[PDB]
Amino acid sequence: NNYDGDTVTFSPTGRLFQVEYALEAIKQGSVTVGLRSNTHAVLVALKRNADELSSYQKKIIKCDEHMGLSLAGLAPDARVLSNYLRQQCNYSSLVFNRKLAVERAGHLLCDKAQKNTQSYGGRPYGVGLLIIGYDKSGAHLLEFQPSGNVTELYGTAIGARSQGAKTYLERTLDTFIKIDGNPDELIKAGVEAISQSLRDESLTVDNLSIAIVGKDTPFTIYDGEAVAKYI
Amino acid sequence: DRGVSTFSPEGRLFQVEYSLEAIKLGSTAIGIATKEGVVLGVEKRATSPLLESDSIEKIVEIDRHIGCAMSGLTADARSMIEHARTAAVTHNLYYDEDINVESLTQSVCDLALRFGELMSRPFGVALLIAGHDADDGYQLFHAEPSGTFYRYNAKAIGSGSEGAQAELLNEWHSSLTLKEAELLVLKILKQVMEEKLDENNAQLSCITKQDGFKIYDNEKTAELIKELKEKEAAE
Amino acid sequence: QFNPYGDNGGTILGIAGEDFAVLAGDTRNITDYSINSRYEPKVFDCGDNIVMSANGFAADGDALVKRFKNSVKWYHFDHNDKKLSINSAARNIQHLLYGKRFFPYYVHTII
Amino acid sequence: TGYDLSNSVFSPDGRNFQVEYAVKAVENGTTSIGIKCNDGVVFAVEKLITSKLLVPQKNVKIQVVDRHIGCVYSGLIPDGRHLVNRGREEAASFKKLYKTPIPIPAFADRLGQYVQAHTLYNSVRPFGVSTIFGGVDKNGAHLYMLEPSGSYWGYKGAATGKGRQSAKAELEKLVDHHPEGLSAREAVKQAAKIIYLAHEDNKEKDFELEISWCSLSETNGLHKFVKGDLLQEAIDFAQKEIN
Amino acid sequence: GYDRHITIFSPEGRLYQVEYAFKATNQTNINSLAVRGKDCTVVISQKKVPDKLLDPTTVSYIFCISRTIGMVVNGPIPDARNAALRAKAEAAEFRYKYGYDMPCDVLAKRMANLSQIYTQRAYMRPLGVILTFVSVDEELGPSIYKTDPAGYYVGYKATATGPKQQEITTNLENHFKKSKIDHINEESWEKVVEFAITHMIDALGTEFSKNDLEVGVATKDKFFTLSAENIEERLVAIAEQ
Amino acid sequence: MDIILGIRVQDSVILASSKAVTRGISVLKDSDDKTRQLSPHTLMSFAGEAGDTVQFAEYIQANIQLYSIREDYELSPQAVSSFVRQELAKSIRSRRPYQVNVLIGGYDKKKNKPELYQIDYLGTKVELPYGAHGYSGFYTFSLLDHHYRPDMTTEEGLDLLKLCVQELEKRMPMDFKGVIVKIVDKDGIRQVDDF
Amino acid sequence: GSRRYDSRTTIFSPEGRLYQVEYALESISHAGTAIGIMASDGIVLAAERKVTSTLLEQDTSTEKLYKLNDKIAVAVAGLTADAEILINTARIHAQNYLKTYNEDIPVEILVRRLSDIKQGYTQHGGLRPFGVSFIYAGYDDRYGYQLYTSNPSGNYTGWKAISVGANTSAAQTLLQMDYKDDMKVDDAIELALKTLSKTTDSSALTYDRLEFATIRKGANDGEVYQKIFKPQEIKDILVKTGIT
Amino acid sequence: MTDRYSFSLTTFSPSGKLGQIDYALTAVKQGVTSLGIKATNGVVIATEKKSSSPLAMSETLSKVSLLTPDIGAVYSGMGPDYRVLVDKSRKVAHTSYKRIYGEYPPTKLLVSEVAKIMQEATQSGGVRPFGVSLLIAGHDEFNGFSLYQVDPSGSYFPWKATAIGKGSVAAKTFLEKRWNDELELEDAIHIALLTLKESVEGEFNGDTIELAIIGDENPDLLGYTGIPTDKGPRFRKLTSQEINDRLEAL
Amino acid sequence: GYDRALSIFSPDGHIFQVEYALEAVKRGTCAVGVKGKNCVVLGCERRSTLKLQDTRITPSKVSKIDSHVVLSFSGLNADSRILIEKARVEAQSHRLTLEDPVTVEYLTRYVAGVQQRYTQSGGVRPFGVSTLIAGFDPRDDEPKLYQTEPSGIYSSWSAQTIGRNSKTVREFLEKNYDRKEPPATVEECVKLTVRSLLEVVQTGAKNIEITVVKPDSDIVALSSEEINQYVTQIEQEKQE
């Protein structure tokens, strides 16, 4: 109200409204799902078009051979944060000959977002990210909020109508965690999860975007006729 | 007052949303992509008859394989064009090749959100970037001051955009010829323009693989306008 | 006085065929009259069907190859996984080398 | 009025309202505690399980500084991480110049001065965390608690977050009933109980217990996380006391 | 009305932020007192530990700035420690540059100048503290110099600070009106501490235990604080006559 | 480059400058004009290190042309020479100094007098009836000391200049490929196309 | 943050005026009147000191008339402290020019430089403008005797006769009435004093309330002399012209 | 952090007033009275030592300060602002003059430097004006004895005699009746003490009054002998006893 | 440094500081440009509220940027000096590096670029100036006339006016200027320019300035008497 003019101002109840408004941009974004087993980790994303002449906005970005994310909210902010992750993954490989741990990648994203919430002149990031990866401790899934809060999960969803997919994953928890050594079935579970968030529209060949990373599987993105198999 | 980088309660940046309103006041620009090429057309909109209309430059070359049309506060486009030209030429210097149309568009869009308290405000102009490369063929992109860019089969920007876009929705198909696209841009420009369309208040251009980016002569466009008039009178 | 350069010996050879290409090199690494290693790989697969070797001062050689491999990685990131053609790789390596025109990589490079 | 719209502005009372609003964010956070024992310190924290999809034991909250200092905090988690990052820089520069690991009182002031500096200007926001930290140095065990204002003192026991009143009362009983002192293993058990008791203010969702400790005899004066059998033993002791 | 938010003049030629910083000074509800002997300078301050969970040994508003200079602070502990760290840095730098120990009055002036800057520059806020510096100076002898948020400072025969400063000040005034000298005519610092505690008891109308007080003593070439057991010995002597 | 000469007569200043440009082993050009017009009635000839000569001359030219446009006024020869001296005096304590020596010949329209200024790369300025740089003065000054009169005509100045060039062509080891001669008077600057 | 307290000194009003410039001009209208008159054989500068005291040391006092070099002088109207900042800058600029070209700086070039400095404070930096208006009296060999004025906007113009400060509307009308092109310095001295005598807010015009200066080629042969009048010399010229 | 106040905090109001300067002058008006009188063979500056507490040692607070050996200063208004201005004035006398010309600046030029500092606090970003008016007395070879007033705006004026602060209006009228161009230094001190008594409520003696003169050279205060051209400072602060001796002949 | 964003968007998509800069141009004295077949004429209004002016030394309204290009303006006089100085420096820089003087279009594009920059840079306000830039490209006989404004947009004009009452004189030019046949001589072009100003000026005395630019750096300013003869002939034809 009187306390939402900038990020440097607490409200009388201890809230940061500019950060909360940045969180609101994620809720307007298109739905994206993340889930994992013990061998693989999967991202599923519903892409959004402007109209029938337009392309469908890409949602998934590769960060390294073993790591990548999906976005929901301001796309240019995801480009800035994914570029930072690419650099950090790269610094780890060049200096230490070491693949960057997914947990450490989450810590770095948290700290970068935090600086934009405590200083004058700047603004919070307006995007939410789901980071998947396979490192020395197996498969991982992370959820990033521009408040700075990063959380490690078995599965989750962000964007508009993400609550339906999140409840489905909460039911299916015991089933999909056991899908080891079967990439197709894990993606099926992710496609079935994101379907619980659809209304009026359904999953078409240029609508659906899928990404997977695992034990002997580099981070790869599937679009176009490559996802017709799962429709 | 309030920050230039402030979010609204709906999760939108005030300044970006306000710049979009300035673009709505701009003159119309239309692009249509075909398998034979991409066509770009603009409304010149001279403020007075004493203004020499061929000095109005709203269609611009970025490289031989990439063209661009603008709508809104057109003075703001000059540094964006400069950056685009530099990025295209620099990549050719570094890699001995043409730059991808998407990559050029992404480089231009990286400038967009570099404002705060860097430049003092967002750009008040939208761009239609059209071109060809070997990997993805003929392409048309819409670059906004939000930093977002969408690829389009056809797109209109400016004051007559929503009426024009509805028209493009009906007319575009995947088998359009270059000639058919030229007439289609002229037809829709004529529909949304205030003044009567002729070769002096409207301008056409195209990008083909063979000949590259070309701005059409007033004599060449005048013939296409006459061809349009006759085929509309044909039924 | 400190000498930032050294000589690690080695010999490399590149030949272009009609529909193929070979890049060969010996595996011996040396300083002065001593052998450092009898097997120290000197020719590297850099991705995109490109092989590279930077012979001479091995520290500069390893640095250059490492930076080019990195350039291939970022070319994919920046240009939609486009394959880096051999001519484009060559021009890129020129800029990596000329960037240190006044403190050069003491190597002879072949791709 | 308008004195509460900008940081570093004195109100007609002589108060900094922005700092007081930062305290509200701290009071909204989960419960965290610290117990000073005979030859060390114990830290514990309540972790709310928002969903079944959270991977158990993975989202670690307690943080180590150097090898002998533990830090836990309630409020805005990112702010706490920022403060610990600075603390790690302060500890590194101290050890670089002076060789010896940073003493706990010395470390306390480094955090204190940094947090206080964020109350001096309107171009920055105060920290939205209260931090409980400490460890073992050459003069023995030390426990500290640091507020958004930059204010800190030494403690026998400390608590912050939503269930701080409940926790404080439990800590006060331990101080009275043990003037001679508490053992490290006893303190771990007691820490588990206090978090379980303090969870009544957050009873809607279930939680996960996380404990760490530094002890001269039990951990050689290094910070370690309580794991496996010793953690389960503390959970059992805690569950027995609430029933 | 933004002339009340930053340190610019109001229409009456006043600086409200400075005035409100003076009010923050009494937020701790603690009173302090300083007096001079023949060979020493004594400072006493109330000690209040309201929480049982606190470690009482860490609760303090008296600071050892240098070997010779002590400082008691009236105001919140964050601003107190800010001023303490800076005073310690200034004292150490002075000795390095000029080859002799920084005098008490010179340090007071330096901190006062820093305070003045906060009243003139907008981006910096005043510190909500009053700083009383004490020493036995090698040239001037026993010394008390006090600084405030306005950037004002002056020497004192004796002084008092806190919510009940006026009661203590008048009590001290009346004693020096009788004796007609600028100090406590006593050989030992122990008896000067006893004088200081006695006259604080008289002025406030309250009794003190060993944990209710905090004492600092400055002699030639060192400043030190008393332990609870040293204070107890002082309290016993007061009660026995 | 090599030989640059100057002579101030009754009503004009005459500058003579060699045409050769030598890249070590070979003479790359034999028609080089080592001069720049700074303003309609002011001419500057130059000699020194390769590259720096033309770079400095054109830099000065640009600055004087800028002044002329800003004020709609031509600076006096004295004022131009002072500006040039300061630039060279600044340059001599730089990271890499301009290794350039100049002669400035100008006709002052206010005083109706020709003026010749000699300035070396250190910023050493002198006003002279006749001057030179390098070894040129060693061969020519004894002839100029004998024959020079302040009331000489332009034609007599050119004849005395021919005698100087003839002595240079006789006793100098280097072939400087003749000289380009230019006259500065009340009507401006012109080149003598047969010398 | 800090934006809250920013007055924004360099913005247009809806009418296209610069707020701070307009308000600075309002300040200058309360300053003591300064007059400059240009004649064929010289220039006169006359200015009124603001309500003085008998205990003010006049013979060592200077608030209106300042020397920039041997050929150029200025009359000040506005904040004296602001004026001395600009005056010192102008003195340095004149010496910079003299060192570079070995010629005295032409009057207009000095005036343009100071005016550009004033302009900058109206377009960038977020600082308040200088509350000063100058009358420049000077001589060079291109245009001869010259009078200029500049104001806080950084705009400058040339004049035959001009006033700044208080009552400029009344003063300018009186000057426009009695000024002629073939006028001489001694006549211009009389006009300047008569105009001040009629426009002054004081009861009477006396020597202790005035500062006076002339720039004459009344220097022995082709050269120019500046004369800052002494208190006794202002008293004499007041008697000569019949004002006291 | 960083100082993000790069804009002026003093600006012109619609009426042409610079508010912050006017308000600074109001602060000066509330200040304790100080005065200065110029004689034929000297200058005197004086003020009241308004002690904040009787426990305070008012000798440790110097309202009259030596700037150079031949120049002194007194103020009315905010004490802390004065103290830092004295520090800056002492330094600028060296950096911008003595380290260049090998001699101390003349009174008028040191006044000019102090004025410039006060002007800049009226235009620079993120600062308020100084809340003091200064009276600066001094001597130099070519200008003789002089007395100047400097205001918050940076404006300065030379005076034969004047007063600033609380009771300045009444004090200036008193000085107008008594001042003439034939006063000796002792006459000016006598008039100074008479004038200052009117604005003082309580005790009026050597311990509550601070007074200094610019007069003859004091070779006894130089600290060394052997250089004929060095004859000692002209600034001298009168003692408590010296003031009381002249209060009997009052 | 002072970084405040003074030029920003409003909810309706307007930048008010740029629009208010145009209001300063509206207040400025009228300026007009007309190009003939082999010349361009720049006419300027002088407000007669200021007499006792010294016209020898007072800044003239038309400024030479180079020997072949001129610039006139309407709006804040002090602001225009900064644009004129920058343009003059760029003109000499172009000659130094390209070894050819600027084209009229290039010089216009530069000045317009400077104006645009001051509309999205922190801590600065836009120029309250619109300019008319006229001249001939090197070795070219085709007349050139361009206009710039505070926003930074620029364009070429057969004839154009800016400043106060420019709406009126543009009305005159739109009905009196024929594109198929532009003023064939210097006389005809100057006559049409003086006529256009007489619609707005007041007295045809010292209120009208006229500058003629011809090819190959031939620029001259007409005197009072020469202009007075045009003023006389125009009204004697009007009495009919």
From Swiss-Prot, chain A:
* Family annotation (SUPFAM superfamilies): N-terminal nucleophile aminohydrolases (Ntn hydrolases)
Q: Which domain of life is it from?
A: Eukaryota
Subcellular location(s) of the protein: Cytoplasm; Nucleus
Please list the residues that carry the modification Phosphoserine. 11
InterPro entries named in the record = Ntn_hydrolases_N, Proteasome_alpha, Proteasome_alpha-type, Proteasome_asu_N, Proteasome_sua/b
Q: Fill in the subunit field for this protein.
A: The 26S proteasome consists of a 20S proteasome core and two 19S regulatory subunits. The 20S proteasome core is composed of 28 subunits that are arranged in four stacked rings, resulting in a barrel-shaped structure. The two end rings are each formed by seven alpha subunits, and the two central rings are each formed by seven beta subunits. The catalytic chamber with the active sites is on the inside of the barrel.
The family line of this record is: Belongs to the peptidase T1A family.
PANTHER family on file? PROTEASOME SUBUNIT ALPHA/BETA
Q: What does this protein do?
A: The proteasome degrades poly-ubiquitinated proteins in the cytoplasm and in the nucleus. It is essential for the regulated turnover of proteins and for the removal of misfolded proteins. The proteasome is a multicatalytic proteinase complex that is characterized by its ability to cleave peptides with Arg, Phe, Tyr, Leu, and Glu adjacent to the leaving group at neutral or slightly basic pH. It has an ATP-dependent proteolytic activity.
Q: What else is known?
A: Present with 7210 molecules/cell in log phase SD medium.
Name of this chain's protein: Proteasome subunit alpha type-6
- Organism of origin: Saccharomyces cerevisiae (strain ATCC 204508 / S288c)
The gene designation is PRE5
UniProtKB/Swiss-Prot annotation, chain E:
Residue numbers bearing the Phosphoserine modification: 227
Q: What are the subcellular locations of this protein?
A: Cytoplasm; Nucleus
- Cross-link Glycyl lysine isopeptide (Lys-Gly) (interchain with G-Cter in ubiquitin) placement: 222
Q: Which InterPro entries match?
A: Ntn_hydrolases_N, Proteasome_alpha, Proteasome_alpha-type, Proteasome_asu_N, Proteasome_sua/b, Proteasome_subunit_alpha6
Q: Which GO terms describe its cellular component?
A: mitochondrion; nucleus; proteasome complex; proteasome core complex, alpha-subunit complex
Q: What is its main location?
A: cytoplasm
Q: Name one GO biological process term.
A: proteasomal ubiquitin-independent protein catabolic process
Q: Which Gene3D superfamilies match?
A: Glutamine Phosphoribosylpyrophosphate, subunit 1, domain 1 (3.60.20.10)
Which UniProt keywords are given for this protein, alphabetically ordered?
Acetylation, Cytoplasm, Isopeptide bond, Nucleus, Phosphoprotein, Proteasome, Ubl conjugation
Instruction: Spell out the family assignment given in the record's similarity comment.
Output: Belongs to the peptidase T1A family.
Another remark in the UniProt entry says: Present with 15200 molecules/cell in log phase SD medium.
**What does the annotation say about its assembly with partners?**
The 26S proteasome consists of a 20S proteasome core and two 19S regulatory subunits. The 20S proteasome core is composed of 28 subunits that are arranged in four stacked rings, resulting in a barrel-shaped structure. The two end rings are each formed by seven alpha subunits, and the two central rings are each formed by seven beta subunits. The catalytic chamber with the active sites is on the inside of the barrel. Interacts with CIC1.
Q: What is this protein called?
A: Proteasome subunit alpha type-1
- What are the leading ranks of the lineage? Eukaryota, Fungi, Dikarya, Ascomycota, Saccharomycotina
Write the gene name. Answer: SCL1
UniProtKB/Swiss-Prot annotation, chain G:
Record's miscellaneous remark: Present with 17100 molecules/cell in log phase SD medium.
Family assignment?
Belongs to the peptidase T1A family.
Instruction: State the oligomer form and interacting partners.
Output: The 26S proteasome consists of a 20S proteasome core and two 19S regulatory subunits. The 20S proteasome core is composed of 28 subunits that are arranged in four stacked rings, resulting in a barrel-shaped structure. The two end rings are each formed by seven alpha subunits, and the two central rings are each formed by seven beta subunits. The catalytic chamber with the active sites is on the inside of the barrel.
Q: What is this protein called?
A: Proteasome subunit alpha type-3
Localization recorded for this chain is: Cytoplasm; Nucleus
What Gene3D superfamilies would the database entry show?
A: Glutamine Phosphoribosylpyrophosphate, subunit 1, domain 1
Q: Which NCBIfam families does the record match to this protein?
A: PRK03996.1 (NF003075)
The UniProt entry lists the main location of this chain as: cytoplasm
**CC terms in the record's Gene Ontology section:** cytosol; nucleus; proteasome complex; proteasome core complex, alpha-subunit complex; proteasome storage granule
Record location of the Glycyl lysine isopeptide (Lys-Gly) (interchain with G-Cter in ubiquitin) cross-link: 99, 198, 230
The Gene Ontology biological process terms listed for this entry are: proteasomal ubiquitin-independent protein catabolic process; proteasome core complex assembly; proteasome-mediated ubiquitin-dependent protein catabolic process
Keyword terms, alphabetized: Cytoplasm, Isopeptide bond, Nucleus, Proteasome, Ubl conjugation
Asked if the Swiss-Prot or TrEMBL record annotates the protein with the keyword Cytoplasm, the reply is: yes
State the organism named in the record.
Saccharomyces cerevisiae (strain ATCC 204508 / S288c)
Matching CDD domains: proteasome_alpha_type_4
Supply the Pfam families for this chain. Answer: Proteasome, Proteasome_A_N
TM region(s), chain numbering: none
From Swiss-Prot, chain I:
Comment field (misc): Present with 16800 molecules/cell in log phase SD medium.
Q: What is this protein called?
A: Proteasome subunit alpha type-4
Keywords of the record: Cytoplasm, Nucleus, Phosphoprotein, Proteasome
Question: What's one Pfam family here?
Answer: Proteasome_A_N
> Cellular component GO terms, alphabetically?
mitochondrion; nuclear outer membrane-endoplasmic reticulum membrane network; nucleus; proteasome complex; proteasome core complex, alpha-subunit complex; proteasome storage granule
Which organism is this protein's natural source? Saccharomyces cerevisiae (strain ATCC 204508 / S288c)
| Family under the similarity heading | Belongs to the peptidase T1A family.
What this protein is reported to do is described as:
The proteasome degrades poly-ubiquitinated proteins in the cytoplasm and in the nucleus. It is essential for the regulated turnover of proteins and for the removal of misfolded proteins. The proteasome is a multicatalytic proteinase complex that is characterized by its ability to cleave peptides with Arg, Phe, Tyr, Leu, and Glu adjacent to the leaving group at neutral or slightly basic pH. It has an ATP-dependent proteolytic activity.
- Gene label: PRE6
Cellular compartments annotated: Cytoplasm; Nucleus
